[PDB]
Amino acid sequence: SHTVKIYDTCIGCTQCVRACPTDVLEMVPWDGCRAGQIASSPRTEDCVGCKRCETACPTDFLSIRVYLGAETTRSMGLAY
Amino acid sequence: XXXXXXXXXXXXXXXXXXXXXXXXXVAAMAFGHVIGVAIVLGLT
Amino acid sequence: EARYLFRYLSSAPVVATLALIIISVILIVLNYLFPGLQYGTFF
Amino acid sequence: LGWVTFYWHWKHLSIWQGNVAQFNESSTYLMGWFRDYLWANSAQLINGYNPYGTNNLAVWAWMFLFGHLAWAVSFMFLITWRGYWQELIETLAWAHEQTPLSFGYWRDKPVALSIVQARLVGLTHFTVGYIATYGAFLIASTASKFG
Amino acid sequence: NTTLVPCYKSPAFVERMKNAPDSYYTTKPLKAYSQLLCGEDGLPRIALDRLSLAVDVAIPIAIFLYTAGFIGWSGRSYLQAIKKQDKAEEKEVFIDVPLFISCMVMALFWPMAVIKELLAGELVAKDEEIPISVR
Amino acid sequence: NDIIKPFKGDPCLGNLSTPINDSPLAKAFINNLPAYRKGLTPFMRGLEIGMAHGYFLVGPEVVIGPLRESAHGANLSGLITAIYIAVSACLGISIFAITTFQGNPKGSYSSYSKDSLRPLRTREEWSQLNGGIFLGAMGGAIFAYLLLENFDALDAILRGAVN
Amino acid sequence: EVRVVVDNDPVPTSFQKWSQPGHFDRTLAKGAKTTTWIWNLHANAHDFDTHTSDLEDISRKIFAAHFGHLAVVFIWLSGMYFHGARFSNFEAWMANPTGIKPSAQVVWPIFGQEILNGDMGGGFHGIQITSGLFQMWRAAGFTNTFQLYCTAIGGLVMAALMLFAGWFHYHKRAPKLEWFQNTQSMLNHHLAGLLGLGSLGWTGHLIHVSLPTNKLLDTGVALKDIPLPHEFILNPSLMNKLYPHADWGFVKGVVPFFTLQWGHFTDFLTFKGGLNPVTGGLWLTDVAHHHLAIAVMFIIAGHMYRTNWGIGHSIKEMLDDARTPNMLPFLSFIGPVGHKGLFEVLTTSWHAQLSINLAMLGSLSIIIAHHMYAMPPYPYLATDYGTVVSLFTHHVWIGGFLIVGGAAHAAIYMVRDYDPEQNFNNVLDRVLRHRDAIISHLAWVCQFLGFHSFAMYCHNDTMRAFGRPQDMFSDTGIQLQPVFAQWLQHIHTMTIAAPNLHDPVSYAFGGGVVAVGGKVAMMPITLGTADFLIHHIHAFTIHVTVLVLLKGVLFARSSRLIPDKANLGFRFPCDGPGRGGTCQVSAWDHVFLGLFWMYNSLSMVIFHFFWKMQSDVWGTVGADGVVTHITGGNFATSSITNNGWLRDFLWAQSTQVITSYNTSLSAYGLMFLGGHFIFGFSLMFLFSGRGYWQELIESIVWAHNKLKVAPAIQPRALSIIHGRAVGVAHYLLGGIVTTWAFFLARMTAFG
Amino acid sequence: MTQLTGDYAASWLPWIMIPLVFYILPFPVFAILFLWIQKEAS
Numbered sequence A: 001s002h003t004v005k006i007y008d009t010c011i012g013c014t015q016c017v018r019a020c021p022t023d024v025l026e027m028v029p030w031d032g033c034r035a036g037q038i039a040s041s042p043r044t045e046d047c048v049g050c051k052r053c054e055t056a057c058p059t060d061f062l063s064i065r066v067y068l069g070a071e072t073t074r075s076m077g078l079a080y
Numbered sequence B: 001x002x003x004x005x006x007x008x009x010x011x012x013x014x015x016x017x018x019x020x021x022x023x024x025x026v027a028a029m030a031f032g033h034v035i036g037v038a039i040v041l042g043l044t
Numbered sequence C: 001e002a003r004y005l006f007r008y009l010s011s012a013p014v015v016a017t018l019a020l021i022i023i024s025v026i027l028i029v030l031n032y033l034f035p036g037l038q039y040g041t042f043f
Numbered sequence D: 001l002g003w004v005t006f007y008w009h010w011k012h013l014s015i016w017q018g019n020v021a022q023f024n025e026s027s028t029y030l031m032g033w034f035r036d037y038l039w040a041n042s043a044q045l046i047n048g049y050n051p052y053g054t055n056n057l058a059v060w061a062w063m064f065l066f067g068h069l070a071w072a073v074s075f076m077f078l079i080t081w082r083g084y085w086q087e088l089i090e091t092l093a094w095a096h097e098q099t100p101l102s103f104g105y106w107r108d109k110p111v112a113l114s115i116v117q118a119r120l121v122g123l124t125h126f127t128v129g130y131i132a133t134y135g136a137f138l139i140a141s142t143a144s145k146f147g
Numbered sequence E: 001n002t003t004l005v006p007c008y009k010s011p012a013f014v015e016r017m018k019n020a021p022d023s024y025y026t027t028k029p030l031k032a033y034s035q036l037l038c039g040e041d042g043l044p045r046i047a048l049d050r051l052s053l054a055v056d057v058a059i060p061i062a063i064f065l066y067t068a069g070f071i072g073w074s075g076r077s078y079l080q081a082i083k084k085q086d087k088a089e090e091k092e093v094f095i096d097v098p099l100f101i102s103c104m105v106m107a108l109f110w111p112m113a114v115i116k117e118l119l120a121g122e123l124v125a126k127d128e129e130i131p132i133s134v135r
Numbered sequence F: 001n002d003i004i005k006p007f008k009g010d011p012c013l014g015n016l017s018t019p020i021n022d023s024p025l026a027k028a029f030i031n032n033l034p035a036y037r038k039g040l041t042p043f044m045r046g047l048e049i050g051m052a053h054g055y056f057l058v059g060p061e062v063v064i065g066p067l068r069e070s071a072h073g074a075n076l077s078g079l080i081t082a083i084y085i086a087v088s089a090c091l092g093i094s095i096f097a098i099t100t101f102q103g104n105p106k107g108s109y110s111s112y113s114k115d116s117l118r119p120l121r122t123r124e125e126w127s128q129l130n131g132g133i134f135l136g137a138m139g140g141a142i143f144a145y146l147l148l149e150n151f152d153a154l155d156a157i158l159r160g161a162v163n
Numbered sequence G: 001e002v003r004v005v006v007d008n009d010p011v012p013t014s015f016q017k018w019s020q021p022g023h024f025d026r027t028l029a030k031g032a033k034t035t036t037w038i039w040n041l042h043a044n045a046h047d048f049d050t051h052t053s054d055l056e057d058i059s060r061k062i063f064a065a066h067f068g069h070l071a072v073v074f075i076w077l078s079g080m081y082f083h084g085a086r087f088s089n090f091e092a093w094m095a096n097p098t099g100i101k102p103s104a105q106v107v108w109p110i111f112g113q114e115i116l117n118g119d120m121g122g123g124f125h126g127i128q129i130t131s132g133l134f135q136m137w138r139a140a141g142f143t144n145t146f147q148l149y150c151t152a153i154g155g156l157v158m159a160a161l162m163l164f165a166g167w168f169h170y171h172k173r174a175p176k177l178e179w180f181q182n183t184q185s186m187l188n189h190h191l192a193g194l195l196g197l198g199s200l201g202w203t204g205h206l207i208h209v210s211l212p213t214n215k216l217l218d219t220g221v222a223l224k225d226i227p228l229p230h231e232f233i234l235n236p237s238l239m240n241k242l243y244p245h246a247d248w249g250f251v252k253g254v255v256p257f258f259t260l261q262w263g264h265f266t267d268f269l270t271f272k273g274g275l276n277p278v279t280g281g282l283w284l285t286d287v288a289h290h291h292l293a294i295a296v297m298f299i300i301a302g303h304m305y306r307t308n309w310g311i312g313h314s315i316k317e318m319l320d321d322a323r324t325p326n327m328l329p330f331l332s333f334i335g336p337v338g339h340k341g342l343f344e345v346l347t348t349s350w351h352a353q354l355s356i357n358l359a360m361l362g363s364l365s366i367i368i369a370h371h372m373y374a375m376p377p378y379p380y381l382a383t384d385y386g387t388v389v390s391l392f393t394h395h396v397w398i399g400g401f402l403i404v405g406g407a408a409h410a411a412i413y414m415v416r417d418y419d420p421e422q423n424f425n426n427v428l429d430r431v432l433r434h435r436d437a438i439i440s441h442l443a444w445v446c447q448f449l450g451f452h453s454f455a456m457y458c459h460n461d462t463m464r465a466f467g468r469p470q471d472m473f474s475d476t477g478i479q480l481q482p483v484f485a486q487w488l489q490h491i492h493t494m495t496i497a498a499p500n501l502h503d504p505v506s507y508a509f510g511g512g513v514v515a516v517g518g519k520v521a522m523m524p525i526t527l528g529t530a531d532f533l534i535h536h537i538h539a540f541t542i543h544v545t546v547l548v549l550l551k552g553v554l555f556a557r558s559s560r561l562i563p564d565k566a567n568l569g570f571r572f573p574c575d576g577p578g579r580g581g582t583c584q585v586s587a588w589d590h591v592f593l594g595l596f597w598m599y600n601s602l603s604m605v606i607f608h609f610f611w612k613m614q615s616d617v618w619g620t621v622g623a624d625g626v627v628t629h630i631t632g633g634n635f636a637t638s639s640i641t642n643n644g645w646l647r648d649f650l651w652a653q654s655t656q657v658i659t660s661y662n663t664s665l666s667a668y669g670l671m672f673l674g675g676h677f678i679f680g681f682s683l684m685f686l687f688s689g690r691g692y693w694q695e696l697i698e699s700i701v702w703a704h705n706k707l708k709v710a711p712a713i714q715p716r717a718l719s720i721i722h723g724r725a726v727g728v729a730h731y732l733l734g735g736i737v738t739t740w741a742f743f744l745a746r747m748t749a750f751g
Numbered sequence H: 001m002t003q004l005t006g007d008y009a010a011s012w013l014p015w016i017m018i019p020l021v022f023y024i025l026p027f028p029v030f031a032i033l034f035l036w037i038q039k040e041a042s
């Protein structure tokens, strides 16, 4: 149960969604970009916290923040 | 020397180690020395 | 060819390494100015 | 404070033993700090118990070596970091589930302790090993030359 | 301080002279330590009295601070010499030794160069020129 | 063909069917240990587990303990070690049973757990186990204590010295 | 069919790419945006597998780089013989190799460092070398410094050949991939032509140079009456007063070999098997017989594999036939596939080969260290106590680094060259498929030994402090005898089956004491409780080193944390702070931690060696036969508490390096402090992270932006992996220099 | 001496309380303190 907030500085480069190993992010239509897209995080209980989405965001001081919060059984990735 | 004559070991190699695998393109006359020298030095 | 070589000789570390080799006055200067040279001694 | 108290102790250990000229002539280079303070004054601390007996410094000789272990185990929490231990605990969790006669099972999943916690667990051992080692040194190196 | 006396009159230091081999090192330097303020242990020392040593606590300091600034000035002036050339990205990995030498000869008279850097308001960058953090 | 199969035929399970866990001899030995024997009340599971452990736990203290030098005192130090290890062990499984069985045990003791390596999943079953483990490890400790403090009297009767 | 196929001038020879460094990586060859580019240019300079993609061009870089490496070793070998030629007391040491200390590498008179030129005996001032070069040149037959000098010349011209051969095989005639992939032909020439002919060549030297020269040097002829080595062959009559049972003529003296009348050779090819009691080394006649036995047995070994004449073995389907219709029943568990697809592993990837070749060169180097103390091969080696310790210690450390490097490339193979299709259900895949049972049982045995080796030292440390020495694991308390090792010590001394060896090999095993110059060359090394406990420390530390390194190989591909750990690479810092934190999950980070465990393990091995010789083996013999050891039986009673290690080994035996100022051992005092600085300095990089350091550069870049002196190569704090590499490189450097200084100051202060 | 004694008053009191607070009471205490940290909030 992390918190992946997306800010208005996205450019719809789509790179944050590809890096996510757990499919938390996905693109929705938007208008504040030439791409007309913005990241959204509908599945954040699945967020593992790897911040691999933040490494891919190219906007300077990146538009997507993982906010490591209450860690549960699927946000810590336990197979046992 | 006189006796010794480890050509019997090589003869027991050429007539036996010519049934290897490829057996084509003689190492039994090389092997017959390895067996031959070991035995003659192993019984002196 | 002797145009790319001379640029390599002055690149980054060879200038630095040679500088430290060229900074060897502390070996000549302290060999014949009676090596012991403490602060109140030299003029 | 391992320089403040080392300097306080050696300066007074030279005055107390009358050998003031030992601190003045050998505290100006770092071997004197290492030969005339640490190596010299450890001698009766480490002989608190030898093969031939045991004396009133046997506890200081033991906490001195206790603090060396508490210091060294800090390096484990400070050098090796979390994800090494999670892949090793994940393996031990496999072994426990698959083995017979082991009837216990964790109420809460065993995980390698977190990043900011190991920095605190390793800082506690470094501190406890810093204080038990020097506390045992300072007590035994002063209360053995003297009363 | 008056505990320090010259090694001329110091019983603990003539003893240093007595049991001294030569070989290159303990005669030619050790005569020159006779002019130093010498403790009650036969060891030359650096004291700060008055005008007695006011020139000797300025020869090392003037020689160092000049050549430390000389290294700093030539190194600094070579950096702006290549920032203006718009080639400073690779001008730094591959030292332009004719330019660097010409920046060293500017750094011989660096103490008078820094004054007219300062008096022109050009040495120090203004505060909102400088990349900073959120603060 | 291969002797190492997927564990009960499911390749996705995190185990292997190996000669050590899935052999006709190895299954027959483990599944008839008192922990797993079919047909035992949990009291008889713990009673038989307890006595096997109380018996051998008095050993390592009566010959390499601190009291080994004498004879009558060595046996006391070995018995009480088995008393203390078992009491603290049976304290462990009373508080294990309290803290795991609290409505829906998180783990291998859930209702839908289907785990064969630990079949005691009830808290009616873990309480007779605690009594068996305790009373067993106490009787085993005493029996190994009585056989050891009477060793000279027992060495004679297994040597025919008593005619 | 084995063939020589090469290319013609594949790579031009120009300095085009010298002036553009980082050309090998496209990311490096676009500009130095930050200082991270500088460090990436060195961490990637030799990873040829990322410069290109084709194995043909990679393998040409490997083969050409070896030549430039062999050039470097030949430069270093030349430097050893040149220093032995004109900067050594080797002439003096040949005359009296007991009272003269070996010394090359004199020191220039500047900075007051002439004090390091200590007295060596014979009026020569220098530094007492402990490399054993002198004990090896005497066994090679060197007598004067002209032979040493011309060998140094013969090595510089030999290094020039290596440099030319490397340029030639990359820029003129580079072999194709077919020439590299016939490893089956390479084994034939390396087994027969290199190791077989090499030891056949050497036993030629031993018989004709070393055996005669060391025969006369044992009778005291004092370097006048020594003939030069060629005068033993030009004058064949000169070797009939020595070894008279042979004939020694060009043709007339060699025919006993061909007519198999080898009894005439029994006087110079002996099988004595002991220590030559006048020099303390092995009998050179016994050594010459060894190399001849080795040569015959390696030339034979080089005919095992099948090159293009049909006859021989094929490794390809010797491997492929280790399936399981055909195994022993108890080890028939390794798959119906078995070893198929594994000849393509060890042929199509160099990291697979480098991992094995390092783990065996590392294990060889440690085996060599154990064999060159227990049976010293060189004259006057065993009595030079500073050389025995510094040769054992050098080769244990060298052997331990190589072993860790064998586990590095076992992990680089996994995340770069591991191929699932050629490795389906085979012997490699079945290991990854149960890698939790391998690590669970390794992590248990690592923990079983941890309590039963170290925690017994804390038992002893506590009973001796309580004053209960009768309930500690002593020889006097609760004895732990090495029953199975004292048994082997009995087996190896009653067999003198093997009856012909009348002299016991390795006096270490038992029987007799050899004293050469009064000093003991070798004694029996008895094993008691202190040797039970120290051997389980060794077992424990080796296992955890294996546990760290094997974990990094098995879990290099994936884990339960990160199932795609192979896509992240071999060398990545982490995968973020999620899953609680995945710091150091890479396979590189298990090499980095295994380096620490190698350091822990080997520094305990060399401490076990150093104390057990000083207490039980080394020493001096008086005029009665009793041996007074250097520390005097100290190991048996006080090495069982690790307070005894700290006071009777570390505090006691550091007296020579602590009190070393104003003496000739002064430099070991500085190295001993220098090693302490570097160890403490390493902990800056190990305990901290680069977020603190990067944020500190920003405050320092500001101070340069203010004075308009900022660089355009933007200062970046070191990478996470770089900062961990710096930490382990300094911890191991500092912690070894302090041990190197402590060993040699202690043993050059004695002899 | 070869025993632990006490010249101080009530010297029998360390004889029983050093075993009590150090190896007899803590395992009950660590059990009570365990039951408190692992109770359902139902």
Ligand code: F6C
Pocket: D092, D095, D096, D099, D101, D102, D103, D104, D105, F088, F089, F090, F091, F092, F093, F095, G440, G441, G443, G444, G447, H027, H028, H030, H031
């Ligand atoms: C109940 C519960 C349980 C059980 C049962 O049921 C168990 C079991 C197992 C088995 C099967 C195995 C083997 C065993 C042996 O060998 O050795 C011993 C050890 C021990 C620990 C032993 C223990 C046992 C029991 C616990 C006893 C009891 C005690 C008492 C009761 C207490 C008292 C109480 C009071 C209150 C205090 C194991 C192991 C391991 N662990 Mg393991 N456990 C567990 C718990 C735990 C915890 C808490 C922790 C943390 C510390 C851990 C940890 C660990 C590690 C590291 C490891 C390893 O290494 C190993 C392995 O992996 O393999 C391979 N683990 N495991």
Ligand code: CLA
Pocket: D069, D072, D073, D074, D075, D076, D079, D080, D088, G442, G443, G444, G446, G447, G448, G449, G450, G451, G454, G455, G458, G544, G547, G548, G593, G596, G597
């Ligand atoms: C001296 C400091 C120290 C100690 C005690 C340890 C201990 C351990 N290390 Mg570690 N390590 C250290 C330094 C240390 N390390 C450093 C400096 C590094 C930096 C590289 C590492 C890196 C490292 C790695 C990578 C690994 C370990 C592993 C281990 C464990 C090995 C298993 C074992 O030995 O069982 C025995 C336990 C001991 C020897 C600890 C001492 C036991 C005492 C003597 C008994 C205590 C008595 C009693 C229980 C006290 C409790 C009373 C109560 C009042 C509390 C073990 C607990 C390995 C592991 O996890 O194994 C599976 C592992 O993979 N270490």
Ligand code: CLA
Pocket: H013, H014, H015, H017, H018, H021
């Ligand atoms: C906090 C102060 C303090 C400390 C550090 C100690 C320490 C000690 N006492 Mg105690 N004691 C204290 C106060 C203290 N005492 C007071 C005020 C009394 C009067 C009733 C006693 C009466 C007493 C007796 C009869 C004995 C000891 C004994 C001992 C020794 C063994 C431990 C033990 O069994 O004690 C048992 C504990 C008690 C009897 C009660 C003391 C608890 C005090 C009143 C409060 C402590 C709680 C603390 C403030 C909260 C911190 C908890 C946590 C945050 C760390 C030990 C050195 C034994 C001994 O003589 O050794 C040879 C012994 O048998 N003490």
Ligand SMILES: CC1=C(/C=C/C(C)=C/C=C/C(C)=C/C=C/C=C(C)/C=C/C=C(C)/C=C/C2=C(C)CCCC2(C)C)C(C)(C)CCC1
Pocket: F051, F052, F053, F055, F056, F135, F138, F139, F140, F142, F143, F146
């Ligand atoms: C695995 C295995 C093994 C092992 C085993 C073991 C481990 C052992 C053991 C064992 C044991 C360990 C046994 C035991 C026992 C016991 C018993 C038999 C007991 C008892 C008891 C009793 C009888 C008691 C009683 C009582 C009571 C109850 C109370 C009162 C008192 C009295 C005393 C009366 C082997 C290899 C060999 C083989 C097989 C398999």
Ligand SMILES: CC1=C(/C=C/C(C)=C/C=C/C(C)=C\C=C/C=C(C)/C=C/C=C(C)/C=C/C2=C(C)CCCC2(C)C)C(C)(C)CCC1
Pocket: E057, E068, E069, E070, E071, E072, E073, E076, E114, G707, G709
């Ligand atoms: C004399 C004396 C003394 C004292 C001193 C003092 C007390 C001082 C001070 C002072 C001060 C109060 C200062 C300062 C400062 C400030 C500032 C503000 C600065 C600066 C700087 C700069 C600006 C720099 C520049 C440069 C140069 C010069 C060159 C190189 C480059 C650079 C840029 C770096 C003593 C006792 C020691 C000794 C004896 C006497």
Ligand SMILES: CC1=C(C/C=C(\C)CCC[C@H](C)CCC[C@H](C)CCCC(C)C)C(=O)c2ccccc2C1=O
Pocket: C016, C017, C019, G684, G685, G686, G688, G689, G690, G693, G694, G716, G717, G718, G719, G720, G722, G723, G724
């Ligand atoms: C100190 C430290 C740094 C900072 C380290 C730095 C900045 C390296 C310092 C090396 C200096 C910068 C060498 C530069 C040499 C210059 C080129 C000067 C040479 C010029 C002369 C030759 C003329 C880290 O980045 C780091 C990262 C992760 C964990 C720990 C640490 C850590 O401890």
Ligand SMILES: [Ca+2]
Pocket: F065, F066, F067, F068, F069, G470, G471
């Ligand atoms: Ca006892």
